[PDB]
Design a protein around this nucleic acid. Structure first.
Ligand SMILES: [Mg+2]
Ligand SMILES: [Mg+2]
Ligand SMILES: [Mg+2]
Ligand SMILES: [Mg+2]
Ligand SMILES: [Mg+2]
Ligand SMILES: [Mg+2]
Ligand SMILES: [Mg+2]
Ligand SMILES: [Mg+2]
Ligand SMILES: [Mg+2]
Ligand SMILES: [Mg+2]
Ligand SMILES: [Mg+2]
Ligand SMILES: [Mg+2]
Ligand SMILES: [Mg+2]
Ligand SMILES: [Mg+2]
Ligand SMILES: [Mg+2]
Ligand SMILES: [Mg+2]
Ligand SMILES: [Mg+2]
Ligand SMILES: [Mg+2]
Ligand SMILES: [Mg+2]
Ligand SMILES: [Mg+2]
Ligand SMILES: [Mg+2]
Ligand SMILES: [Mg+2]
Ligand SMILES: [Mg+2]
Ligand SMILES: [Mg+2]
Ligand SMILES: [Mg+2]
Ligand SMILES: [Mg+2]
Ligand SMILES: [Mg+2]
Ligand SMILES: [Mg+2]
Ligand SMILES: [Mg+2]
Ligand SMILES: [Mg+2]
Ligand SMILES: [Mg+2]
Ligand SMILES: [Mg+2]
Ligand SMILES: [Mg+2]
Ligand SMILES: [Mg+2]
Ligand SMILES: [Mg+2]
Ligand SMILES: [Mg+2]
Ligand SMILES: [Mg+2]
Ligand SMILES: [Mg+2]
Ligand SMILES: [Mg+2]
Ligand SMILES: [Mg+2]
Ligand SMILES: [Mg+2]
Ligand SMILES: [Mg+2]
Ligand SMILES: [Mg+2]
Ligand SMILES: [Mg+2]
Ligand SMILES: [Mg+2]
Ligand SMILES: [Mg+2]
Ligand SMILES: [Mg+2]
Ligand SMILES: [Mg+2]
Ligand SMILES: [Mg+2]
Ligand SMILES: [Mg+2]
Ligand SMILES: [Mg+2]
Ligand SMILES: [Mg+2]
Ligand SMILES: [Mg+2]
Ligand SMILES: [Mg+2]
Ligand SMILES: [Mg+2]
Ligand SMILES: [Mg+2]
Ligand SMILES: [Mg+2]
Ligand SMILES: [Mg+2]
Ligand SMILES: [Mg+2]
Ligand SMILES: [Mg+2]
Ligand SMILES: [Mg+2]
Ligand SMILES: [Mg+2]
Ligand SMILES: [Mg+2]
Ligand SMILES: [Mg+2]
Ligand SMILES: [Mg+2]
Ligand SMILES: [Mg+2]
Ligand SMILES: [Mg+2]
Ligand SMILES: [Mg+2]
Ligand SMILES: [Mg+2]
Ligand SMILES: [Mg+2]
Ligand SMILES: [Mg+2]
Ligand SMILES: [Zn+2]
Lengths: 208, 104, 83
RNA sequence: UGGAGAGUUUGAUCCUGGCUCAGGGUGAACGCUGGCGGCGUGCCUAAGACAUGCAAGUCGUGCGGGCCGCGGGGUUUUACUCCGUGGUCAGCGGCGGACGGGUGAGUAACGCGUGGGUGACCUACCCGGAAGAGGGGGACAACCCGGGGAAACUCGGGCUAAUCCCCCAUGUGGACCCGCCCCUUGGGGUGUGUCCAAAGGGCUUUGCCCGCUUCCGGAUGGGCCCGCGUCCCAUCAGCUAGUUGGUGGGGUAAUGGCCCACCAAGGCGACGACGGGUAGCCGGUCUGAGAGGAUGGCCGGCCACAGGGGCACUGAGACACGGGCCCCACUCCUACGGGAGGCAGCAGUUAGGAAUCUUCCGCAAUGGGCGCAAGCCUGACGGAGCGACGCCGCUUGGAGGAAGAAGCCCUUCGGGGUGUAAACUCCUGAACCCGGGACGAAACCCCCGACGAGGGGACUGACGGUACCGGGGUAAUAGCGCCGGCCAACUCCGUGCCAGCAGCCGCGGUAAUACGGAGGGCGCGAGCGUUACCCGGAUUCACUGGGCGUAAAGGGCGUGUAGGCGGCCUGGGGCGUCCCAUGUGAAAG
């Protein structure tokens, strides 16, 4: 994926599990277990009252870190969203969620987003029956996201779709565990997501 | 359409030519207030038919000389040196504002 | 004299001509007198050639001389067809 | 649908007020770092100088020749001489060289923008329409002969063709003078008089094609004029005598002091003349809530310039970047007499500079010139090259993995941190290998058909064996800035007003979260910082949106000129103002 480096050290710094590793992020080993405090020599030091600014800086980091997106891309998406019609907060979340690499995570083909990102890159994914190896690729209502017919027998893809059997998926989505096909029914709504982020602080972060 | 302007004849001391002082009004591009700006046109008069104080219409014309690209169309109303006076005084007032002394 | 020719408007390796009426002396991509169509050589979309025969005919009737490729296209759209 | 503020003057406070930071932007440059690709973009300085190659030609269907062939005739044979055909060379003649490409030096201007005017005009080639091309004559190159020069080349003598020059004719028509009429600044008509046309060529030859002439018109391109708009200094206030106007003339496609002779005495200026500084203008671009500020690279339009200055010739068009003449500076050749040159075309060199690229591939595509066509020419252009210079996409892995290795590290010595990070397990599989392999190209052309409409056929790819598709396949670059406050991030040690930081506040004179290192941390990541510069915040020139008792700011007072401003009622006009319609507002953005 992106960033490349200790990931659980970010959950630590955000003091909120940003579930991004699949297993472990459930088992008593997410570091957020018996180690909730942030990383570094001063992790357990009595934290000082954060500054109005620090607060918005961390909220924007928590969000962007969840999708594993660069600030360059995050910002470009936010600006696009800003000028667009409709509550910038939701539209922004709507867009982040429309990234192919994300839709793959959402459909369970991958246990995490970094994995989903690698699956898309290595050509194991297909949009509308055509190979699309762009994590930033924007899915649109009606698109069918499937597993590449030649990758349908990958040891990883099996166990991952096996686990999706009986398992429910986002209301704005829908998948057929059999044909390993997914469907982007519609852009998710604020209420559809359960993100540990007050995106209002993010809009504010970009007006400073 | 050949521009038609209306002004006052301030100069007459010319052969087959009269000077027409034309004014115009317009809002200041930045400050709004309506301001009056003026301009003198040397208009053609083949018959030396117009004199000082004559308010005449001037029409855009084929060059008659350097400076002369307008001809006197018609007379709008005559005699009225009140208009010529402003010009004259304003002209004489130029004596005071300079480096040399002047009973302006 | 005035011509009916193609003006280049795509991008590198992505040519998209614009069938225009211009004086023979202008840059091929300079100021034309009128656009009367367009043409995508690679036919990337079903609509890779529009012409407006009406207009093509007005200019032809007043002098406009089309290049060879220009008429090839104008004809393909029935500018000269009289059936 | 659009507007965030912060630090810093005091012991403390409020205010005033400047400085400074957070944001965005750039033809960038510099430092450390640096993997792939697409698309853009790259001398901003000395408009300094330029080696070399290339950057405009093309027509044998306009003409006659020279040189080098091949072949056929006249003849009993030679000499001699006639014809046909191929190549080649320039010449005459024509169309193009006034476009395309470059640069912004100059210019503060009708230069540009915008809206209009031309009864004051032009427009090659293209399109439509009308009429026509009968006869005669001439010369100059080529070539041949001779002369002067080192060369550049130049002088003379002789011959010759034409779509070259001239004469006579026809006069559709058109031009001019005078008159009349309609219009009304030189528009249109008409009458007499005068004046003016032409070119030939080719065959799928006794017609058809290419072309010629005069005229009316179309289309396109352009000249000239006018209103309005277009930077700083008033420590620049007076300026002007071709100056301002008139008459006549010259000139031009055309108006005009455009130019000239003569006459008048004018014209311009504080609503900023003249003078000085700076500057190509615009569509737009950047910024800004907006108003506005700044700007004009790339692309598109206009202008201007082609070593500096002047000038005109030829042309439909030039006062002409790769045409001509002269003066000047300079380089070069020189037999010193005298000559040859001008990359602000592409590429490249050299100089200057903090700094800006390949002496590349192709004319396959689009566009241009010339040709009936074949086709030739196109450093326009289409492409590839170099540079993180900009934008976008992408990679350096994915999942599992200890209450947690080693080292480093802090330690109240018990532990704490780096760290699921690593190792390691498994999975995928950037690179790279093999295979296939494009779109961009269908026209011109030729056949059928009328050299038309329409139908049919063939040739043609620089990029490129590149994109893309399929098979195989390795875990496989990370950096830079920062952590006193503003401003997200703290500890040890070294140092001791030193060494040094420092955008502004300010740090350092022995326990320094501010120097240097280290661990750790924050931020961003193929980049990150720095310097410079523009807009913002800065209502810090305030039109929106500020002020002047004591903060900077009321003129020492008055009189009064221009100018600004102006009581109540009615009426006309309708300039300002408002409304409707309509035209314009190129494309790109
Ligand atoms: Mg595979
Ligand atoms: Mg702001
Ligand atoms: Mg302040
Ligand atoms: Mg004080
Ligand atoms: Mg203090
Ligand atoms: Mg380097
Ligand atoms: Mg490039
Ligand atoms: Mg330059
Ligand atoms: Mg040379
Ligand atoms: Mg060449
Ligand atoms: Mg023989
Ligand atoms: Mg020849
Ligand atoms: Mg040009
Ligand atoms: Mg000046
Ligand atoms: Mg002019
Ligand atoms: Mg006109
Ligand atoms: Mg015209
Ligand atoms: Mg004709
Ligand atoms: Mg003859
Ligand atoms: Mg001879
Ligand atoms: Mg000789
Ligand atoms: Mg002779
Ligand atoms: Mg003869
Ligand atoms: Mg005759
Ligand atoms: Mg006649
Ligand atoms: Mg008349
Ligand atoms: Mg007449
Ligand atoms: Mg007549
Ligand atoms: Mg013939
Ligand atoms: Mg005087
Ligand atoms: Mg005169
Ligand atoms: Mg004349
Ligand atoms: Mg005189
Ligand atoms: Mg001046
Ligand atoms: Mg300049
Ligand atoms: Mg804007
Ligand atoms: Mg403002
Ligand atoms: Mg603006
Ligand atoms: Mg502007
Ligand atoms: Mg430039
Ligand atoms: Mg341009
Ligand atoms: Mg011009
Ligand atoms: Mg030079
Ligand atoms: Mg001439
Ligand atoms: Mg040159
Ligand atoms: Mg140097
Ligand atoms: Mg070509
Ligand atoms: Mg061509
Ligand atoms: Mg891992
Ligand atoms: Mg060809
Ligand atoms: Mg036939
Ligand atoms: Mg055909
Ligand atoms: Mg690895
Ligand atoms: Mg600091
Ligand atoms: Mg802080
Ligand atoms: Mg020391
Ligand atoms: Mg110390
Ligand atoms: Mg101390
Ligand atoms: Mg420290
Ligand atoms: Mg301001
Ligand atoms: Mg104030
Ligand atoms: Mg005071
Ligand atoms: Mg007082
Ligand atoms: Mg005083
Ligand atoms: Mg009143
Ligand atoms: Mg008044
Ligand atoms: Mg009234
Ligand atoms: Mg009115
Ligand atoms: Mg209007
Ligand atoms: Mg319109
Ligand atoms: Mg537009
Ligand atoms: Zn976690």
């Amino acid at each position: 994926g992106r960033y490349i480096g200790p990931v659980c050290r970010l959950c630590r710094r955000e003091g909120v599990k940003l579930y991004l590793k699949g297993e472990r992020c459930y088992s008593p080993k997410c570091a957020m277990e018996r180690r909730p405090y942030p990383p570094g020599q001063h992790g357990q030091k009595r934290a000082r009252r954060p500054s109005d600014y620090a607060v918005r800086l961390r909220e924007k980091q928590k969000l962007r870190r969840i999708y594993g997106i660069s600030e360059r891309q995050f910002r470009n998406l936010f600006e696009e969203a800003s000028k667009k019609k409709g509550v910038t907060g939701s539209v922004f979340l709507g867009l982040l969620e429309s990234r192919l690499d994300n839709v793959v995570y959402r459909l369970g083909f991958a246990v995490s987003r970094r994995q989903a990102r690698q699956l898309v890159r290595h050509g194991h994914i297909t949009v509308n029956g055509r190979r699309v190896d762009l994590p930033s690729y924007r899915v649109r209502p009606g698109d069918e996201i499937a597993v590449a017919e030649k990758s349908r027998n990958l040891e990883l893809i099996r166990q991952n779709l096996e686990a999706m059997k009986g398992r429910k998926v986002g209301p704005w989505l829908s998948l057929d565990v059999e044909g390993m096909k997914g469907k982007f029914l519609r852009l998710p709504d604020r209420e559809d997501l359960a993100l540990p982020v007050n995106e209002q602080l993010v809009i504010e972060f970009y007006s400073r | 359409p050949k521009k038609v302007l209306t002004g006052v004849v301030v100069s007459d001391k010319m052969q087959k030519t009269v000077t027409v002082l034309v004014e115009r009004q317009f809002p200041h591009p930045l400050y709004g207030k309506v301001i009056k700006r003026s301009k003198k046109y040397l208009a053609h008069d083949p018959e030396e038919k117009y004199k000082l104080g004559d308010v005449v219409e001037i029409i855009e014309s084929r060059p008659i000389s350097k400076r002369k690209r307008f001809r006197v169309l018609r007379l709008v109303e005559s005699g009225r040196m009140d208009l010529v006076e402003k010009y004259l005084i304003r002209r004489q007032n130029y004596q005071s504002l300079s480096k040399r002394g002047g009973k302006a | 004299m005035v011509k009916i020719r193609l003006a280049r408007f795509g991008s590198k390796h992505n040519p998209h001509y614009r069938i225009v009426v211009t004086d023979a002396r202008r840059k091929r991509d300079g100021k034309y007198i009128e656009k009367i169509g367009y043409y995508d050589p690679r036919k990337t979309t079903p609509d890779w050639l529009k012409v407006d025969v009406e207009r093509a005919r007005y200019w032809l009737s007043v002098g406009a001389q089309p290049t060879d490729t220009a008429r090839r296209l104008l004809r393909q759209a029935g500018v000269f067809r009289q059936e």
